[PDB]
Amino acid sequence: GSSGSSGSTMSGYLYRSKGSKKPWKHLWFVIKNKVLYTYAASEDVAALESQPLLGFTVTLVKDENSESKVFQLLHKGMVFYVFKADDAHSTQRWIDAFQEGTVSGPSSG
């Protein structure tokens, strides 16, 4: 329960990695139709890749660079790729953004 609503679920440059000690990758990402699309530039003409968050998972990682500003994209239980967010606040967003992506929301009403 925070932030208004004006734009896509989440969109911002992040750093992809296959784990620690691995080289980061500056790429653009977006969340649409509950799918994690890949990009290169904000003003891109087409997504580099597209991967649905159906069955996937997310979790916070200790990491060395950050303490709680970087997460990992789990898939079936195994880490698919790493992701670093600007600040902690952001991370949480991406996290919940990735968490609420695989799920469909809790039971209400």
UniProtKB/Swiss-Prot annotation:
Residues 8-103 form the PH domain. It is found in: Cytoplasm; Cytoplasm, Cytoskeleton. May activate CDC42, a member of the Ras-like family of Rho- and Rac proteins, by exchanging bound GDP for free GTP. May play a role in regulating the actin cytoskeleton and cell shape. This is FYVE, RhoGEF and PH domain-containing protein 6. It comes from Mus musculus. The chain holds residues 1303 to 1398 of 1399 of the full protein.
